A = this chain, B = another copy of it.
Amino acid sequence: PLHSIISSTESVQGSTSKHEFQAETKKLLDIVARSLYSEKEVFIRELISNASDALEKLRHKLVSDGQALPEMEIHLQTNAEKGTITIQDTGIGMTQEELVSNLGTIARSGSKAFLDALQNQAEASSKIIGQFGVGFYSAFMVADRVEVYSRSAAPGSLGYQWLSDGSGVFEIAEASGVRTGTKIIIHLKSDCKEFSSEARVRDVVTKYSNFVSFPLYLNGRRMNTLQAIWMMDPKDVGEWQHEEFYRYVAQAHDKPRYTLHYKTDAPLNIRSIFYVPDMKPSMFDVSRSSVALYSRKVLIQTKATDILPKWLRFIRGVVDSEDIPLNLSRELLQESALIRKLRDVLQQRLIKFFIDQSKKDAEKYAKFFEDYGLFMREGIVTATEQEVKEDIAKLLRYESSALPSGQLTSLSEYASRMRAGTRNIYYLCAPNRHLAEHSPYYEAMKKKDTEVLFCFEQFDELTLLHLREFDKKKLISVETDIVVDHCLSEKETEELMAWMRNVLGSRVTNVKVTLRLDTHPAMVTVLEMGAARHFLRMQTQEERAQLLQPTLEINPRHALIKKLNQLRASEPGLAQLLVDQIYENAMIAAGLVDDPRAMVGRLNELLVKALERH
């Protein structure tokens, strides 16, 4: 069933004509005002941007000739009674020809011509936002009437008037009393009157245009009050400025424990600033990137592209980049190659910065780790490439047996002090270092003369098993090492073995004797012990025993096992409770108990009849 109608039989017959592409301006205005911007409030964000652009242009016109610089400010006025919003700038302005060519032509931007006329592309090319030519028409999203008083900064220009109802036709005229620059009056729509309120305009400006290059006033009072410290050199910004900027961006009243100021240009233009907070991460921090994109000092509002890896969501800051590709809606182009390389560069930069911070201050980095280790663990368990795995794992800090309590150690320094030819890193998980030292697995492991890391946090063995390799050395837990590795009389021991296997057949698939234990009555070993511990939390007792294979081990030298010999015959009934309690204790010590609430009654009725002789 493979048939096609594709053929090359067609050919040109008549003389070829020639035509020029046209454009339906009415439908273009409809598209811009209805089906371009998801958020209705961006119209001022464009306009303010335009204002800044104009001012930037004026600065060039006052730098090339080297003359005096008058006041350069942007003004927002709100008239609830008239239902209007006014955006005024003292920038270059626009003449008759400039108003007709720029305002009257869709996708025609005077900024692009201005940038191409710089002949340097180093002063205003990085500070001009307008690049499409449709930003102004977003004003028609909310306005049934746009009224522009524009006059140029040229010595002898005239005030000019520009009315448009947004219906594909606009009128122009000569106006008197117009101040140098451009003042746009927007008459709000019936349903868009909410933009004729002080609070809404203030919210939008603090959402989009806080860090414009020029002072910005709303209804009379300046509302910027905070320069963008991510633009100048890191040496020129102080600790107080860093703290204030962190307080603004993170919406928190504390200070940043870590500050990074990255400024790179060889791979791509990145001016980023990041802060790791002093306070412990909050519950909101764990839930999902807390870093705001900026392009020419205006917000992008991605909120979905994740310019920063998810595990690095605990840091707060900004990223500025003039190279990112923006769509017509002035939003980030999803799944862009440039944004992916930006994310990778930022991730590697932050990993390197954390490594240098660890080298610089041991105690401060130890505090940072005990605060934010869950994020690095999540990054390890969620990464794909082994290089990223190792880079994040270099940030881990686990205290080991070879060092005193409370002295955390890295994986790299642990590997730097192993034996000559052992490619094995051993880790043991316990709630506390005291239990780790007194863990049955560690006591069995004491036969081997090696150093073992101690893990106390949740999802830590899971992190180590996901890492699975560091510095070309395999990661094997103590339980896994015990499994993979290959008093009482013999007759009494064997008969006790048979009795326990008979009375624990359903729950234990194999019982054996371990002479490596000294202070623990019993041990539980599993093939994939680390994987089993995590799987048990994801998915009566025989149900888990089927897929767990709880290999039980007993120590004949322990007091309970020794007393079991007389407890099996004198009162065989209590011996069943005793061995069940020993099995449950070994289960709990192994971490293979979903909830110990079931064994409480068994333990209580063991205690009531165990010490009744007293």
Contact = CB atoms under 8 A, between A and B. Distances in A.
Nearest to A5: B75
B597 A581 contact: no
Contacts of A36: 327-328
Given A220-B2, A540-B432, A31 B107 contact: yes
Interface stretch (A48-56, A115-123, A279-287, A487-495): A279-287
Interface in A597-614: 597-601, 603-604, 607-608, 610-614
Contact of A105 (B21, B174, B183, B520): B21
A568 to B, nearest CB: 11
Contacts of A384: none
A371 to B, nearest CB: 9
Interface stretch (A199-207, A354-362, A585-593): A585-593
Contacts of A248: none
Interface string A209-244: 000000001011110000000000000000000000
A4 B77 contact: yes
Nearest to A562: B608
A1 B578 contact: no
A17 interface: yes
B24 A105 contact: yes
Interface in A225-268: none
Interface string A526-562: 0000000000001011000000000000000001100
Interface in A20-47: 20-29, 31, 34-39
A596 B597 contact: no
- Per assembly, the copies of the chain total 2
A599 B593 CA distance: 13
Contact of A607 (B12, B38, B610): B610
A149 B11 CA distance: 9
Given A171-B19, A432-B540, A35 B132 contact: yes
Contacts of A18: 169, 171
A108 interface: yes
B571 A614 contact: yes
A463 interface: no
B521 A171 contact: no
A580 to B, nearest CB: 12
Contacts of A585: 600, 603-604
Interface string A491-520: 000000000000000000000000000011
A282 to B, nearest CB: 5
Given A304-B304, A597-B589, A4 B175 contact: no
A566 B37 CA distance: 81
Interface centre among A38, A177, A282 (most CB of B within 10 A): A38
Interface centre among A24, A283, A521 (most CB of B within 10 A): A24
A279 to B, nearest CB: 7
Contact of A282 (B19, B90, B106, B541): B541
B20 A608 contact: no
A540 to B, nearest CB: 5
Interface in A142-165: 149, 159-161, 163
Given A283-B541, A596-B593, A12 B174 contact: yes
Given A35-B132, A600-B585, A614-B567, A19 B169 contact: yes
Interface stretch (A329-337, A387-395, A406-414, A476-484): A329-337
A13 B175 contact: yes
A12 B105 contact: no
A168 B285 CA distance: 49
A572 to B, nearest CB: 12
Contacts of A178: 10
A35 B326 CA distance: 6
A574 B88 CA distance: 85
A108 B13 contact: no
A6 interface: yes
A589 B603 CA distance: 11
A541 B279 contact: yes
A383 to B, nearest CB: 16
Contact of A10 (B161, B538, B596): B161
A282 B538 CA distance: 11
Contacts of A173: 12-17
A22 B571 CA distance: 101
Nearest to A164: B21
A3 interface: yes
A3 B74 CA distance: 11
A473 interface: no
Contacts of A4: 75, 77, 217, 219-220
A172 interface: yes
A28 B16 CA distance: 25
A4 B36 CA distance: 33
Contacts of A109: 27
Interface centre among A23, A100, A163 (most CB of B within 10 A): A23
A430 interface: yes
Interface in A170-208: 170-179, 183
7 contacts: A1-B221, A2-B221, A9-B177, A15-B174, A20-B25, A38-B334, A589-B597
The 9 A-B residue pairs with the shortest CB-CB distance in the complex, in nearest-first order: A14-B174, A2-B220, A23-B23, A23-B106, A21-B25, A4-B220, A27-B107, A10-B177, A38-B334
Given A23-B107, A31-B132, 4 more contacts: A5-B179, A10-B176, A280-B540, A431-B597
